Amino acid sequence: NFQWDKAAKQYALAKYNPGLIEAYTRIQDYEGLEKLIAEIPERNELLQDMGDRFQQAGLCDAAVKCYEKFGDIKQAIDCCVLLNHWNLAVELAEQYNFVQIEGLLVQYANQLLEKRRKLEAAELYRKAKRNTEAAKILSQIADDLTERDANPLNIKKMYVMAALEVDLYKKRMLDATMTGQATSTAKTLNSLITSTINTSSADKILNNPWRGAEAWHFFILAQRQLYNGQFKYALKSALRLGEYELEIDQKKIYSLIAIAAYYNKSFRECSRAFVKLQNLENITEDEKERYEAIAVSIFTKHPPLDSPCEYTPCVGKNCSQQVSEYDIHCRACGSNFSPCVASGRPIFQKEFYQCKNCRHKMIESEVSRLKLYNCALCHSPIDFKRFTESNNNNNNNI
Amino acid sequence: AQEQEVSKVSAPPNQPTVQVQDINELQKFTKINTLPQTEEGVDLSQLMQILSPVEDIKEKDEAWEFLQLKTQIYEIVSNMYGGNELIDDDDEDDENQ
Amino acid sequence: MKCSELWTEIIPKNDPNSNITNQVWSCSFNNDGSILLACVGDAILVYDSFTGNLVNKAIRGGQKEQINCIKFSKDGKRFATASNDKTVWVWSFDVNKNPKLAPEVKYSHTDKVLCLAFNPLTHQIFSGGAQDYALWTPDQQSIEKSKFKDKIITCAWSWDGLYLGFGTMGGIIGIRNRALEQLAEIQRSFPIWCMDWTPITPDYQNSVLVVGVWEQSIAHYNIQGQQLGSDKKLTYDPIDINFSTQGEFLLVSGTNNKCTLYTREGGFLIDVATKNDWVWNNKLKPVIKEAGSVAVQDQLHVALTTNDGEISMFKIQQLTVHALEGDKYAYRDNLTDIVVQSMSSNQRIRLKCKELVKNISIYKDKLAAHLTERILIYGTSSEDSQMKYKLHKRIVKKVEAHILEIVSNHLIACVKNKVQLYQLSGDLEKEWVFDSRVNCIKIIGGMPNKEGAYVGLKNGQIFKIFVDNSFPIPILNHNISIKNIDASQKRKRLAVVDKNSNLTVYDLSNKEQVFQEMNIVSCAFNNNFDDLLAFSSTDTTFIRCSNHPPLSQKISGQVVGFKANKLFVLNDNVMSTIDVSMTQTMIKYLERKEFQSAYEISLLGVTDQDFLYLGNEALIATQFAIARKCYTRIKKLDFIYLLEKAEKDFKKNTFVEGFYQGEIYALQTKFYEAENALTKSNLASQAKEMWIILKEFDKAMRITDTGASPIN
Ligand SMILES: [Zn+2]
Ligand SMILES: [Zn+2]
């Protein structure tokens, strides 16, 4: 009589699975179908039936679950590929030893690339642990950006966007993993924590996807500070750019370093930058010529004089040899200093805190002076005093 | 009456006024610190070919949202690649509609 | 929505070194609309509204100077011609008489005449020029002239026939009565050009003066002279103002050489035409409505007169936008209105809005209205049979899209070659970019935040979109462009229509062109049987089943929806429901012995006679379950008794179908064919014992004379 809800409730009361299935399909209430697949004992043709229904409905998670319960795995891979559910496809292929998925994703990414959808290809590579190719694509996008007006804030936006997408994908995967774990998973997580205590700088550097974002932000901050006086902060920022030298090419970094060093009268850094600039990889004869002409004029007007400053005691190690304020290299000790995104000054004090989105060390005095309500890099909109208290608690835990 | 007030209170700048603060900086900055370079026999005009105008570079603490940054970046890469408008012109929508 | 030019007449007789020019100042329009008038330097032109030609030759020499204004008398019987010769003539008019137009009464002021106006009720003339204003009454034939301090520019009489309004280039606007006394005076700082009176309306029943000042503003004034405070601003200086009949629209012209349309509140709707010169006078065609007449009245007609000497005619046609999901039909009424109609009780529900609606989409117990830069959503109380609409949420964000749809907790907008997904809050969520323009989209059911949809492009490729996938799934490819698509109830087949009115049916399991049809306007799938297709051409609607010849109806209209034993036909903008008989399909299914599908078809609300028929064949062909269902659907006792007798006797005895066929036949009043059936194979004795019970023994003896008793 085309009254599906009453028929469904009668079938549920009478323990009739097929009629319940058609009734739930007609009412389009697949929650009852999820309850059914949880209730259907094992290995029936009805499993294939609800798997096909789920695949038609577009919920390939339930379709794959039904196919795996049925005993067929290739149909689950077919559903995952047809609906472009690539995370589940990669997990199933890794668990079931499927080898064609990598190549298939390769030509699908190539097809997207030929359709001029590089960001979609980057998203696809993010979905399948291929972040290196996505990073290369984003670097190419930034290089294309430099060819035009090239507002650096847009490049900062795109790099922070890539980092946040990677962090989001990782956190969904982790939240899926921890929920409902066993003793073996607990032991694996304990070993992971033990390795996390004794980490290495290189591994953390590779893991962090904020390299381009922080590099571009430091470039923008250096330029902005240099325009509005504050030369000494500009030198520290330019030194940070020279400490990255990965996304930004040598020319811009050394140009900014030379400008800042000339404006602050610190001529050792200016001489180093000018020696760097004479031959990066290739240069025309006339450009090189005007470069040494500028160098000779600058260094023949008056000899390079080192501007005295304060040699604050080192906090990285127990050595009594003080290190210059601008220097972050920390020679003969190997203890490099973490940056401060707020102003660029190296962390030389106990007061340092970070948020749980970008984990960059913040100096309390700089934030108080600038009255920054948000994180300088990722713009996290939560009260900073509470972050300071939380970091103090975390340090007390350590 | 309430609509206008609430919109003005929130006013999320979507496209039109994201960073529209364009004022000549090639001549404004040469007032700030260029004179010391000029009285002396120093030529660094090549070396300032790297810096960009700062009046375009907007400096103020705002709120960054995941989705609206995503939309801005997609719209930027789209008009960079310039593929939407060419196929729109090849679509001859005005001829049909 | 669409604006189409009708006929243009140009007057190029420019005369240098002469004060007579080729400009046109005013265009008087008749109440009926069968005739039109225009004024040119030293001439008056008469035109037909429908076709552009001079019914009468241009009159020259009557007035030795230019003609400033021409107006009818709201009855199509008089003209008033004011000239710079300091004189005003009034002419009598009638189409049937041999002299169509002839001067009747001429009078003269002291200076040049600038404006004229008529009385809707008493047909009195008010003519105002420099230094003077005069009133003429037909009965007395005595004019009343009065002096004033500066030249009046425009005049307008109220629709009640009581009040009069005039304006001066010095900024003074005066409102007087029929006795010409200073009822109200308002002083401004800018010249006054255009005024009008709002038409009387049963909803409003109050008349106000609408005056367009030259400081880029439009003002509403009451009778006492107190402003209503609107003071709506404009980008361009207005020149002419005209109200449509019943006070629904407002035609505004002036600077920027554009003729625009507005609502009476002030909402912009469309721009009629851009001539590339100042439009001196634009007029609307009044309409006459019969007592209880039914008509969409979408057509609108405008007449424009420009500075260079072009008198052009434009026609405005309003498109139809509507939505139909289930048990409801929400269609756009006269602009800025939404009417929801139910097909059962024919009851209507009206929603009134001020701005123009662009798209109407209705989901489950939810309706979405797309106002200009505004979005409204209304829910429904399901428990009550009558619906109650309450505004749950409102969206202020401005969105432009030719197609808008609402799904559970999401909105979809199609703009150019892009599809945008909007949250109910307003912020954009996801984007999809396609090669060509997205022509038609169809939404299919599913879970919240997981509703799929179908998309057709101008190229023709049919794609599928999921909300969270963010990756289009190529369904199929079509060479011609796509106009409308439909999905089967089970999602087994898909019907697609091209630009040539060609219908093609594609199977989803195997991509093949199973069915092709020519000259198809619309099509629809059934929502209960999954197999019936009802497609309507321009004049004839055909219903087709699986491997069955089409059914013709010659019904006037287009098919929009198909439900169980129901087809929806829409004519113009009204809708109707028509029932269909399933007897033909039932018979054809009985022909090939697929009793299951025949019973499924008969379950769609068929008459009890077909039910007993199908039960009879089900019992005959040894199908007891379907026979029991058919004999149970209609209250029958003897047939079901014979049924359990047959099912009990089937397992043991030979189960000869002749006896049961004869018993079925004899259960009705027709007996002779049952006798013949029992006589056919061999059942004479059982026929005799069967026919004895009803006590007419003579014919039983007639039967037993031939029948034998092979026992011993
Ligand atoms: Zn040290
Ligand atoms: Zn941060």
Side-chain angles (χ1 to χ4, degrees):
Chain A
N1 277 23
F2 304 129
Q3 315 192 34
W4 288 119
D5 195 5
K6 307 180 179 179
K9 77 187 60 153
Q10 289 308 315
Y11 285 148
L13 273 177
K15 281 77 60 174
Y16 197 57
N17 287 333
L20 267 165
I21 293 166
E22 291 92 7
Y24 283 141
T25 307
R26 295 283 78 77
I27 318 171
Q28 291 178 356
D29 177 29
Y30 296 123
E31 307 320 306
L33 194 56
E34 293 178 351
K35 268 77 174 177
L36 289 177
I37 185 56
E39 294 293 328
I40 300 285
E42 270 174 350
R43 275 69 174 174
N44 315 106
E45 190 270 332
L46 295 173
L47 276 70
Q48 174 75 216
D49 216 7
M50 51 214 67
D52 184 74
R53 287 187 198 269
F54 274 132
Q55 182 259 7
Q56 187 64 249
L59 285 84
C60 197
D61 193 2
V64 162
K65 189 175 180 180
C66 297
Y67 284 143
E68 191 274 334
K69 294 154 158 263
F70 176 51
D72 207 336
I73 306 308
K74 64 99 174 179
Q75 299 171 0
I77 292 296
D78 293 323
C79 174
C80 282
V81 174
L82 196 41
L83 305 197
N84 294 325
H85 278 102
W86 284 120
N87 186 31
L88 261 174
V90 175
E91 305 325 297
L92 294 164
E94 193 275 331
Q95 194 183 334
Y96 188 73
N97 317 309
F98 186 72
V99 298
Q100 308 179 27
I101 179 169
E102 290 83 3
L104 177 56
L105 190 140
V106 159
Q107 72 265 13
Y108 190 59
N110 287 329
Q111 185 173 355
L112 287 183
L113 280 169
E114 293 179 353
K115 290 179 179 179
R116 306 291 294 274
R117 278 314 300 119
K118 286 187 183 177
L119 275 188
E120 292 303 319
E123 215 174 52
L124 273 195
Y125 286 140
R126 276 195 286 249
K127 297 290 180 67
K129 295 181 184 292
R130 275 250 182 174
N131 298 295
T132 68
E133 282 283 334
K136 293 179 179 179
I137 290 173
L138 298 166
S139 178
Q140 190 171 356
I141 290 171
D143 289 331
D144 299 329
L145 283 168
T146 310
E147 295 177 351
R148 277 180 184 173
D149 63 358
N151 289 153
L153 293 175
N154 291 351
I155 315 160
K156 184 165 84 166
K157 295 285 184 67
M158 71 76 88
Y159 268 116
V160 170
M161 186 66 204
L164 187 45
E165 283 198 30
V166 170
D167 168 79
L168 199 65
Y169 185 77
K170 177 256 285 182
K171 71 165 69 68
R172 282 83 58 84
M173 183 278 288
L174 290 186
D175 292 334
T177 314
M178 321 315 148
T179 297
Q181 69 177 22
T183 44
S184 48
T185 304
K187 289 179 183 178
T188 317
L189 189 143
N190 201 1
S191 178
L192 278 175
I193 281 176
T194 295
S195 72
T196 308
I197 289 167
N198 296 116
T199 43
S200 162
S201 55
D203 310 311
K204 189 263 181 183
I205 280 159
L206 301 163
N207 287 336
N208 217 9
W210 297 68
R211 219 83 184 167
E214 64 197 342
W216 277 104
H217 163 59
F218 268 92
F219 173 84
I220 300 158
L221 178 54
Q223 176 175 345
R224 207 200 302 120
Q225 278 170 354
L226 190 147
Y227 266 70
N228 285 344
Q230 291 176 352
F231 298 155
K232 295 182 178 181
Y233 290 87
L235 274 71
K236 305 168 186 180
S237 296
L239 286 173
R240 185 60 64 194
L241 278 72
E243 204 60 43
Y244 284 119
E245 76 265 12
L246 186 45
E247 293 84 0
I248 308 290
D249 58 353
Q250 306 200 329
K251 182 178 178 180
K252 293 189 284 184
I253 289 169
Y254 290 130
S255 175
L256 211 56
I257 293 176
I259 281 172
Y262 172 63
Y263 292 166
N264 190 179
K265 318 313 158 164
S266 185
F267 282 105
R268 198 182 216 197
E269 315 279 10
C270 186
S271 160
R272 262 159 166 162
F274 264 50
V275 172
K276 285 324 183 192
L277 278 170
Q278 289 212 137
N279 58 5
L280 304 170
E281 198 274 330
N282 51 348
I283 183 167
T284 74
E285 195 274 331
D286 56 355
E287 290 297 319
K288 185 177 179 180
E289 192 275 331
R290 44 197 282 179
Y291 273 121
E292 75 265 13
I294 293 173
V296 166
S297 179
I298 297 298
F299 289 126
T300 310
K301 157 191 173 188
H302 63 266
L305 308 170
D306 299 326
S307 190
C309 55
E310 45 174 5
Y311 316 132
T312 72
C314 169
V315 296
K317 287 306 294 187
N318 275 102
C319 68
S320 296
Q321 184 175 355
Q322 295 147 226
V323 181
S324 185
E325 175 188 353
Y326 305 105
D327 197 1
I328 65 184
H329 194 250
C330 194
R331 200 199 71 147
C333 302
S335 166
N336 45 3
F337 309 127
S338 290
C340 181
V341 174
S343 295
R345 176 184 182 174
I347 307 299
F348 277 106
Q349 267 307 92
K350 158 64 187 73
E351 287 159 18
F352 68 92
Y353 67 100
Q354 70 269 16
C355 62
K356 309 319 291 182
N357 283 320
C358 83
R359 70 195 85 94
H360 287 74
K361 283 80 174 175
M362 295 298 102
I363 297 169
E364 180 181 2
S365 74
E366 307 318 286
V367 185
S368 294
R369 187 261 180 274
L370 279 154
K371 284 163 299 321
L372 298 186
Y373 312 144
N374 304 273
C375 195
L377 184 62
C378 62
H379 291 229
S380 296
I382 297 89
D383 183 75
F384 57 94
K385 302 287 287 296
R386 304 285 85 81
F387 286 108
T388 316
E389 290 182 350
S390 188
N391 192 45
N392 295 345
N393 301 138
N394 299 326
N395 192 214
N396 290 137
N397 300 337
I398 293 169
Chain B
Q2 297 182 337
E3 166 187 44
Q4 187 173 355
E5 295 168 347
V6 172
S7 281
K8 185 177 180 179
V9 168
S10 292
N14 182 9
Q15 300 310 106
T17 53
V18 167
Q19 57 177 28
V20 174
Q21 288 176 354
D22 281 346
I23 291 171
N24 288 336
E25 278 296 320
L26 74 163
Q27 300 299 265
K28 202 186 148 271
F29 171 60
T30 44
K31 316 279 195 162
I32 299 170
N33 297 118
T34 306
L35 283 160
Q37 190 262 9
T38 61
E39 315 107 341
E40 302 168 352
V42 169
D43 188 332
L44 290 159
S45 180
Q46 151 166 25
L47 183 63
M48 41 205 77
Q49 289 175 332
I50 301 299
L51 52 83
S52 56
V54 293
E55 197 71 18
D56 191 6
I57 297 170
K58 144 63 161 63
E59 44 172 312
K60 187 263 182 181
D61 46 346
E62 283 181 354
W64 280 357
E65 263 181 8
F66 186 54
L67 302 172
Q68 64 85 210
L69 264 62
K70 209 177 162 198
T71 311
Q72 293 171 336
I73 294 164
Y74 278 127
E75 292 174 352
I76 284 283
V77 67
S78 65
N79 71 10
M80 159 84 98
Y81 276 63
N84 300 97
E85 279 282 339
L86 62 83
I87 203 66
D88 192 8
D89 293 344
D90 286 344
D91 203 4
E92 73 265 354
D93 185 19
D94 294 342
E95 281 314 308
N96 280 287
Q97 206 192 314
Chain C
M1 183 278 288
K2 67 172 75 69
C3 298
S4 64
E5 197 264 359
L6 203 68
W7 62 268
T8 289
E9 209 278 338
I10 184 159
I11 182 68
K13 61 93 175 179
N14 201 331
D15 308 319
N17 290 126
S18 200
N19 50 2
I20 296 90
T21 178
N22 73 316
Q23 316 173 21
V24 55
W25 291 93
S26 65
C27 50
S28 173
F29 196 75
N30 205 22
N31 55 1
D32 313 299
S34 74
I35 199 163
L36 187 140
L37 313 174
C39 61
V40 194
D42 211 351
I44 299 95
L45 305 176
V46 194
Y47 282 82
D48 205 314
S49 44
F50 284 108
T51 184
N53 55 1
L54 302 185
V55 64
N56 193 359
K57 64 90 176 179
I59 295 95
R60 297 192 88 95
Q63 300 291 280
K64 286 296 216 53
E65 306 291 338
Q66 294 178 357
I67 301 312
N68 285 267
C69 185
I70 300 288
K71 186 179 282 188
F72 270 107
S73 67
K74 272 74 69 176
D75 208 59
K77 300 294 186 291
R78 295 221 175 74
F79 320 124
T81 75
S83 65
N84 278 27
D85 207 18
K86 316 168 181 182
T87 186
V88 176
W89 289 18
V90 61
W91 307 49
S92 297
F93 180 62
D94 193 359
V95 291
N96 64 7
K97 46 167 188 153
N98 189 359
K100 292 186 290 295
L101 58 86
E104 177 207 320
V105 166
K106 45 196 67 169
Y107 58 91
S108 68
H109 304 163
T110 307
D111 215 351
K112 53 168 65 70
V113 194
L114 294 179
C115 53
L116 58 90
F118 267 52
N119 197 310
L121 292 200
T122 59
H123 307 317
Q124 303 173 2
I125 296 186
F126 181 61
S127 59
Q131 190 194 352
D132 273 322
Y133 64 86
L135 188 153
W136 176 83
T137 308
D139 166 79
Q140 178 51 45
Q141 292 299 293
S142 178
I143 46 160
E144 190 276 331
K145 296 202 229 178
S146 160
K147 293 181 181 180
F148 190 72
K149 64 190 186 162
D150 46 358
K151 40 172 190 191
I152 303 103
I153 302 302
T154 310
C155 297
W157 282 81
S158 166
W159 291 107
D160 291 331
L162 289 168
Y163 301 100
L164 168 65
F166 64 89
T168 315
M169 51 65 58
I172 291 178
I173 53 161
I175 300 154
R176 303 175 169 257
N177 68 341
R178 292 176 64 188
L180 300 188
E181 62 91 19
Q182 315 95 2
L183 187 63
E185 294 293 328
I186 297 96
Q187 159 88 59
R188 303 290 285 268
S189 49
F190 282 89
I192 305 297
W193 210 274
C194 55
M195 331 175 278
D196 206 359
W197 287 92
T198 55
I200 202 71
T201 300
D203 189 358
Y204 296 91
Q205 81 197 21
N206 190 359
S207 69
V208 297
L209 201 43
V210 166
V211 60
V213 295
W214 268 76
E215 66 176 8
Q216 304 176 354
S217 170
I218 178 63
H220 297 236
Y221 280 91
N222 220 345
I223 301 105
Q224 300 100 23
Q226 187 61 251
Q227 191 179 320
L228 288 190
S230 179
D231 202 353
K232 163 176 148 57
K233 291 298 268 216
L234 288 184
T235 304
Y236 50 87
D237 292 330
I239 282 180
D240 189 21
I241 281 181
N242 197 76
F243 293 100
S244 88
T245 315
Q246 284 97 17
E248 290 173 350
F249 299 135
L250 172 83
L251 197 71
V252 192
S253 165
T255 316
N256 291 322
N257 316 324
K258 287 184 179 67
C259 184
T260 51
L261 199 70
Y262 288 88
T263 46
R264 70 180 299 143
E265 308 292 336
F268 178 74
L269 260 52
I270 50 171
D271 49 348
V272 179
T274 306
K275 189 269 182 184
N276 189 359
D277 208 354
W278 281 21
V279 178
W280 278 123
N281 206 332
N282 48 348
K283 289 291 214 268
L284 294 169
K285 171 187 280 293
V287 294
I288 308 85
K289 181 69 165 62
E290 277 63 61
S293 173
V294 290
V296 165
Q297 300 279 355
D298 44 45
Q299 295 294 321
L300 287 175
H301 282 72
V302 307
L304 321 178
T305 59
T306 191
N307 193 64
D308 270 328
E310 288 82 1
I311 43 174
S312 184
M313 187 66 204
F314 287 83
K315 179 177 85 68
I316 317 300
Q317 184 178 2
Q318 307 157 31
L319 273 297
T320 67
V321 292
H322 47 74
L324 197 149
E325 189 258 6
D327 201 19
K328 298 169 173 64
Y329 165 72
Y331 78 102
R332 166 177 100 186
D333 202 74
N334 207 359
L335 297 184
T336 74
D337 281 323
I338 299 169
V339 179
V340 177
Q341 166 175 356
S342 179
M343 72 291 291
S344 65
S345 173
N346 279 296
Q347 58 187 355
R348 316 258 187 98
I349 296 91
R350 191 163 273 254
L351 190 149
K352 298 247 199 162
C353 70
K354 320 308 277 201
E355 293 179 353
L356 180 74
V357 290
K358 310 223 305 205
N359 283 307
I360 296 96
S361 297
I362 177 166
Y363 207 53
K364 57 166 73 70
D365 65 58
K366 287 225 293 193
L367 64 86
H370 172 42
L371 290 167
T372 293
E373 300 176 349
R374 306 186 207 231
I375 314 289
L376 291 195
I377 58 170
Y378 288 99
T380 307
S381 176
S382 61
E383 184 177 2
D384 196 74
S385 280
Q386 293 177 335
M387 81 305 298
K388 184 177 179 180
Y389 289 131
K390 183 178 179 180
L391 195 140
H392 295 284
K393 286 196 82 213
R394 177 215 182 182
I395 310 174
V396 64
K397 184 177 179 180
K398 336 179 179 179
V399 56
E400 192 273 330
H402 56 102
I403 295 180
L404 185 134
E405 188 45 46
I406 178 168
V407 303
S408 82
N409 212 4
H410 273 90
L411 194 142
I412 296 94
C414 294
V415 54
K416 294 178 179 179
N417 61 291
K418 293 178 179 179
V419 172
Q420 311 169 347
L421 181 69
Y422 282 93
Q423 262 179 8
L424 293 176
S425 296
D427 57 283
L428 189 148
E429 209 273 335
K430 206 170 287 187
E431 296 174 350
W432 284 281
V433 166
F434 297 90
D435 292 330
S436 293
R437 200 173 99 90
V438 180
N439 264 356
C440 173
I441 63 167
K442 183 175 174 66
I443 188 67
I444 52 179
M447 296 276 156
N449 307 307
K450 295 255 181 170
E451 289 86 353
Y454 286 79
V455 160
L457 305 182
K458 196 170 290 270
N459 316 319
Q461 297 194 155
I462 286 173
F463 285 95
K464 191 168 190 198
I465 295 172
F466 280 105
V467 165
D468 53 301
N469 268 359
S470 88
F471 277 119
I473 297 103
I475 290 297
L476 59 89
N477 195 332
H478 204 300
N479 63 6
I480 318 298
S481 47
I482 305 316
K483 267 66 182 171
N484 196 1
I485 53 175
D486 205 316
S488 183
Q489 188 274 331
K490 177 264 168 184
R491 323 287 176 215
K492 184 75 220 74
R493 318 164 178 267
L494 183 136
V496 65
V497 62
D498 308 326
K499 66 170 303 313
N500 295 342
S501 300
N502 291 29
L503 187 151
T504 299
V505 180
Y506 288 117
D507 200 349
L508 280 188
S509 173
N510 63 6
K511 276 81 172 176
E512 53 91 19
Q513 181 186 178
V514 54
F515 196 80
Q516 180 63 253
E517 189 68 27
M518 187 66 204
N519 193 6
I520 295 309
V521 175
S522 175
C523 70
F525 275 87
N526 196 355
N527 289 334
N528 286 59
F529 191 60
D530 187 71
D531 214 346
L532 269 76
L533 277 296
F535 47 92
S536 171
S537 170
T538 80
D539 65 300
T540 309
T541 288
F542 306 89
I543 311 174
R544 174 173 284 266
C545 194
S546 158
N547 269 319
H548 282 49
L551 286 77
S552 165
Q553 276 278 123
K554 204 64 178 211
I555 183 167
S556 69
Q558 324 279 12
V559 159
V560 170
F562 199 103
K563 299 291 180 68
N565 203 343
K566 206 160 297 300
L567 61 83
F568 300 123
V569 166
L570 183 137
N571 264 316
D572 197 358
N573 211 356
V574 291
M575 61 79 71
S576 52
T577 63
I578 295 91
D579 286 21
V580 291
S581 68
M582 283 73 74
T583 315
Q584 297 294 327
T585 312
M586 183 278 288
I587 291 297
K588 204 142 182 274
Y589 280 168
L590 265 294
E591 289 289 79
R592 293 180 179 91
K593 298 170 75 175
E594 58 271 17
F595 296 83
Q596 178 49 244
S597 184
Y599 169 60
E600 181 48 51
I601 287 296
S602 78
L603 212 66
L604 281 190
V606 187
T607 315
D608 84 359
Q609 188 274 331
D610 295 348
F611 268 107
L612 61 83
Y613 182 76
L614 173 58
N616 287 320
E617 288 98 17
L619 185 142
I620 288 299
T622 302
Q623 290 220 10
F624 295 101
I626 310 302
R628 208 186 302 266
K629 274 161 180 89
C630 291
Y631 286 138
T632 304
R633 179 66 65 192
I634 54 166
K635 298 287 99 176
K636 199 73 64 176
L637 195 59
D638 292 328
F639 276 78
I640 193 174
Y641 265 109
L642 270 299
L643 173 60
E644 72 265 14
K645 171 144 197 52
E647 69 90 19
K648 186 191 52 64
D649 199 2
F650 175 48
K651 285 176 277 295
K652 275 69 62 183
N653 189 359
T654 181
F655 181 65
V656 167
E657 215 59 34
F659 166 71
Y660 281 156
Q661 178 88 270
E663 290 295 327
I664 285 300
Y665 287 169
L667 272 186
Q668 295 95 21
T669 306
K670 51 184 189 76
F671 303 130
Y672 182 76
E673 94 283 13
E675 175 197 341
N676 205 66
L678 271 76
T679 316
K680 271 197 276 287
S681 298
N682 214 345
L683 269 183
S685 189
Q686 204 152 359
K688 297 186 275 284
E689 66 89 20
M690 183 278 288
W691 177 256
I692 287 295
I693 313 161
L694 58 94
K695 285 185 177 180
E696 61 90 26
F697 274 11
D698 186 74
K699 196 251 201 180
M701 295 298 102
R702 186 267 182 275
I703 301 157
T704 197
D705 284 338
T706 303
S709 80
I711 296 169
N712 282 327

